[PDB]
């Protein structure tokens, strides 16, 4: 059907748009599952084949395939894409590196400050890109059964510049996401710290007092012995025994970290081994093996059917039946295969396949293993520097990730090590972690690197609350996301080129990304201006109406603006017509909430739908009429908001309303934002009286933005620009 | 030397002078092609504006009142008019805001900040428009300066500038369309009467003479050699003068020393963006300042 | 082939020819080098060089002149009316260079991909070619043609029936644009069938744009292969004809001629150009022909663009190139009046200068003596003679130190350092004397360059 054979290759159409080419020289062509690709039936498509004594080529309604025989080289094998948009070259050849793709990610963390080199991914301005499988054979059940008999392997992706769709082909090749629990969806807390079952119990008492919800408690490698390890054995930092001098009731500390409900996981660091002075390392002795006369078992192999299950049964398994959730592997080692596999990779794997009994769809904290490493959630990076340098990459590299099919980074909140101390820099990058895939606050064995709120000053402490209650307020619109991203393959946060892939701005601006589907966001990463005393960043607004998402200042269609914030305030902003659920309660701890706010952007129709484990909520904006519907029956309430007014508080089942008559305005007003702006610059006294005056006085737009053209500091020009445009 | 003499045109006397030295030569020839040329046009313009400076020097001995006067003269109430100290109003009809500061060398254009009062101003020499009260900063070239007139000004003119007669025997009337005007051109022996109503202009005479009349109405000529007195109505012809944006953005973008993809991608997205709003929000985004100020003079005059 | 120590080496790597003119696959030697060890004699080493690989042929006369060339959609009339400009404003020309936009471009069908390539008239632009290329030679103008045939012969050309034809009949219904240069009745095609008719309607020869990277089919470069049968048939046509292509390594000065591009338009390539051009006559190419008013990028200079057409009159090949952009007009009358009239002088000059040029042209033919040389061809054994990278002889009479660096504003005058050997040099224009050996930082306006004789 949709297999070619011609000389010593193999050419099949998976799709119009994806080709996978095989070379064999012994004459046998992989058929099994590899590590990187997991599925490869698909639909049936049209194509032609012409056929000469020495030659083929292949006809597709968008690739055009040539090949000469004989061995891959870029005079044998190439190809021609032929798409609506044109490009300086269109013509692929095997082996020589093409330009235009817009790279994915990395598999180790590499930058100094700021950028690093990532690598490429299958998605490219001019069209086309090549994924190689490079793998190894994959069995039936889960298990590596050696080299593959193809010499090489390729995938051809030739979908121009429809991402989604060669995106959601992916998925379908290597397989789709696993959906994450919801607990995984609020704010981690996480310090390298020598903590004790009461001083953990009043930090997170502490935590409560001050209004900071948390979902997720890590407890780091010192929960485990350390320093009474004994002199023979080497680096303690491999630990399955619990230190009974901080923890004397390790049963009682998880039941009342469960009673605050929270999820607990622990660090764990297998590379050592299991020695002899573990607690549970007799029961693995009478698994494995016996030592002779006087010896140790830490034979860390997890190739070994035997030494997993023990590992999985009696290492683990009180540790679990305590009522640890999930596991923090941390493996810090260099690539040390054995049989010729990535140790990462097998650990991620069988990891993942285990925690799956403790709850339903569990996860793990691991590292990126390269592709096919997106079924295993979730990898963390961190390793990053704590500077405004690494705060600009990093957007940019979390948007790009979606690239490659991962879209669940975990990037430590605060940075990691090194760096200088800045108290706007980490208000700005919690910013910017409250609106990504996962919020998880990191701090080192330092005095000086504490992440709590109540470490700072007044105004820094109550933004940082507000923006943490933020992120609870949000779980809702995060599950949906999870949910959709695990049923169809769209990613949670996507370059602005995923939606508006024929024009050029999209294309230049790194750190500006879509998260979710209702929401646009374009974080500061750069320091306030003292002068202004306002951060500022350029953003695109493609064409409609855009409300700024928590003031409802209004930007106009297809403009180039620099806007500005002061270090309490974000950029994020909705289109007309857009609505965002909300919870009502984020500190109240509720597997499902009980109320949910509805925000309403007036001047569009609308439509959204929240998805549950157990039920799936209609949102219809249609005419001035907003219809709430239920697939099942509920006892939660409602509550409506109409830009900024209060429409209904606390409506009872699936209503419908009307909003003809209300006021399609928020409370955003030029005189007042003006009068905020001009308060908090550091300039003289009578230029602010001056401008105050002068543009309340001037009626026409054109003759006010000359006004403020004359002004001799060109920052104040801009930000009064902006205000100006808003109110035009 | 050139911006000099530019302002000493449009100056009470203009009086060339130089020292015992063979190189303070005012000569026009004495510096390179572009000079000398503007250097030319401009002392011809000065003969020109013969008879508009006689009659200014009439009405100064009869009545009092200055050829050159500083703008708080004619707009006593308001304070931007005490805030251009190098602005002036020569006789009643002209503004003039001489260019006193060095081109800029990437722009190669000079400029000056200008004070607009109520009403509409136009360049006395491209026909550049201008709106109401507004303090601009506006480019010109070292072979342009900046004289402006307001809707309704009536200017005359002598034809034949190279000509020496005592009294000129043809004169060219330039009218700027928007509003009623009025002028009286005051002689030795004699006293002519220019209206400017509904449209209708009239030029009377109180003696009889043999001057012919040319008609400028904008930039295009109406009536040439008219002879006598005489009446003519202007309501049908072309009010608006030869300027428009397009070849004036290529113009100023044409002569700018930076890059050609700059300059390409200036005149594409300008050229494409329809709204004024969003077309001064493209040209606030350009990180050099003073093609910012170029441009939004450019696109100001273009609303 | 030259060096300071006295000795080089090079590497034949090419591949065997035959008695007739085609590839015969690899060589049977594993290794072949050729040892230069003529010392400090350049001279004699370019001439035994010529000797090894073959004399560079003749060029003809209208070559010498002044090349006009603008990515431009011109119109027959609008064209016209260009050279009876470029007439009136006392301007000569030698070559009128069309570029691809004379063919079809925005009108190819749709199933068709890029069409760059092309071989049909555009009669909406081109009404009557026959008439256009008549009048071009009335005003007594050699035409040219830019040719893409990366592509190939599509079934959309007017000349396509006869090649299908000659080559292969479509089978049931496809096309015929089968650009492989290696068969012999796939050349002889295209170059009866497809140049056949344009150049009996009058066109001179063809500017080949090649701009790919290198595909080798049979082991051998195809750039390599179109210079050497292109030049071969271009000398049907007319007497001692010229190609313009790129460069293809050792052996390529036998095709001339061969152009560079893609400089941008900057100081820093006007202060390159110059010894770029003097440092090729040691391996033999001594026919460039750069891009006069520099190609893509950049910036806008007049200066800059004044002191690129004073080298480049004084270089090997004069032609002014523009791109598509009405920024980046080459027109003398673009400028202000001093910078036209220096323009207008120094292309006058170049019309001057021809019968030297001509001259120069047969003795390098003869005895292999190249225009442009560094100056320790001629004084080998001084050590000034290697410090001065831009300065160089043209000819055998003339020495020429352009000014590649921006006038200095205080002065309104720019410099260059020019080394002076033993004896009383004059400059070309004003006549300025000049002593024995030394070593002089002189200054000249922008409508003067320093080109120097020497006494006798």
Redesign the interface.
């Known amino acids: 059907n949709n297999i070619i054979k011609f000389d010593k290759a193999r050419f099949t159409v998976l799709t119009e748009h994806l080709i996978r080419i095989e070379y064999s020289e012994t004459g046998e062509f992989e058929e099994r599952m590899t590590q990187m690709v997991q599925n490869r039936e698909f639909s049936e498509v049209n194509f032609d084949i012409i056929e000469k004594e020495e030659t083929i080529e292949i006809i597709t309604s968008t690739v055009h395939l040539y090949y000469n025989g004989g061995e891959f080289t870029?005079?044998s094998l190439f190809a021609?894409v032929?798409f609506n948009f044109?490009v300086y070259s269109?013509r692929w050849y095997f082996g020589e590196k093409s330009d235009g793709n817009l790279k994915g990610t990395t598999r180790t963390l590499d930058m100094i400050d700021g950028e690093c080199p990532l690598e490429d991914g299958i998605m490219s301005k001019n069209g086309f890109a090549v994924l190689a499988d490079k793998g190894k054979v994959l069995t039936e059940v889960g298990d590596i059964a050696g080299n593959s008999v193809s010499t090489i392997d390729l995938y051809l992706f030739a979908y121009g510049r429809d991402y989604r769709q060669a995106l959601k082909d992916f998925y379908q090749l290597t397989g789709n996401t696993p959906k994450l629990p919801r607990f995984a969806l609020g704010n981690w807390w996480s310090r390298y710290y020598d903590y004790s079952d009461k001083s953990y119990l009043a930090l997170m008492d502490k935590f409560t007092d001050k209004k900071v919800p948390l979902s997720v408690s890590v407890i780091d490698m010192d929960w485990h012995k350390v320093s009474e390890v004994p002199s023979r054995f080497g680096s303690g930092w491999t630990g399955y025994s619990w230190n009974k001098k901080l923890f004397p009731n390790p049963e009682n500390f998880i039941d009342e970290l469960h009673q605050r409900k929270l999820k607990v996981t622990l660090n764990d660091h297998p590379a050592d081994g299991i020695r002899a002075f573990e607690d549970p390392y007799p029961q693995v002795a009478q698994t494995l093996d016996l030592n002779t006369e006087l010896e140790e078992a830490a034979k860390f192999d997890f190739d070994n059917l035997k030494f997993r299950k023990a590992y999985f049964e009696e290492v683990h398994g009180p540790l679990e039946k305590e009522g640890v959730d999930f596991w923090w592997i941390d493996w810090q080692q260099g690539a040390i295969s054995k049989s010729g596999v990535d140790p990462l990779w097998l650990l991620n794997h069988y990891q993942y396949q285990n925690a799956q009994k403790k709850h339903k769809n569990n996860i793990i904290l691991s590292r990126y293993a390269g592709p096919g490493s997106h079924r295993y959630p979730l990898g963390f990076s961190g390793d990053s520097v704590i500077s405004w340098a690494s705060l600009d990459f990093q957007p940019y590299f979390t948007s790009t990730a979606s690239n490659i099919g991962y879209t669940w980074w975990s990037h430590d909140i605060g940075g990691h090590m090194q760096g200088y101390k800045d108290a706007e820099l980490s208000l700005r990058w919690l910013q910017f972690g409250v609106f990504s895939p996962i919020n998880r606050l990191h701090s080192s064995k330092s005095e000086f690197t504490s992440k709590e709120p109540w470490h700072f000053d007044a105004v820094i402490e109550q933004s940082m609350i507000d923006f943490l209650q933020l992120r609870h307020q949000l779980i809702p619109y995060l599950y949906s996301a999870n949910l959709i991203t695990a049923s169809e393959g769209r990613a949670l946060v996507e370059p602005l080129y995923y939606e508006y892939p024929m024009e050029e701005e999209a294309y230049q601006h790194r750190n500006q990304y879509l998260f979710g589907e209702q929401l646009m966001v374009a974080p500061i990463t750069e320091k306030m201006n003292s002068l202004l005393q306002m951060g500022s960043v350029?953003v695109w607004f493609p064409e409609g109406t855009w409300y700024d998402f928590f003031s409802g200042q209004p930007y106009?269609?297809?403009?180039?603006?620099?806007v500005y914030r002061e270090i309490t305030e974000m950029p994020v902003f909705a289109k007309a017509g857009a609505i965002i659920p909300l919870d009502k309660n984020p500190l109240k701890k509720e597997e499902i909430p009980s109320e949910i706010i509805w925000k309403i952007f007036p001047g569009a129709d609308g439509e959204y739908l929240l998805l549950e484990e157990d039920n799936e909520t209609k949102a219809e904006f249609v005419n001035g009429i907003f219809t709430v519907t239920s697939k099942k029956e509920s006892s939660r309430k409602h509550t409506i908001i109409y830009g900024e007014h209060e429409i209904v508080s606390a409506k009872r089942g699936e209503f419908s309303i009307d909003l003809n008559g209300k006021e399609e305005n928020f409370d955003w007003n030029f005189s007042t934002a003006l009068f905020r702006r001009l308060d908090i610059a550091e300039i003289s006294y009578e230029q602010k009286d001056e401008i105050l005056q002068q543009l309340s006085l001037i009626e026409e737009?054109?003759?006010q933005?000359?006004?403020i053209?004359?002004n001799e500091n060109?920052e104040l020009q801009?930000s009064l620009?902006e205000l100006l445009?808003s109110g035009?």
């Open positions: 870029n005079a021609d032929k044109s269109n350029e106009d269609g297809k403009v180039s603006l620099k737009h054109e003759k933005v000359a006004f053209k004359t060109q801009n620009f445009y035009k």
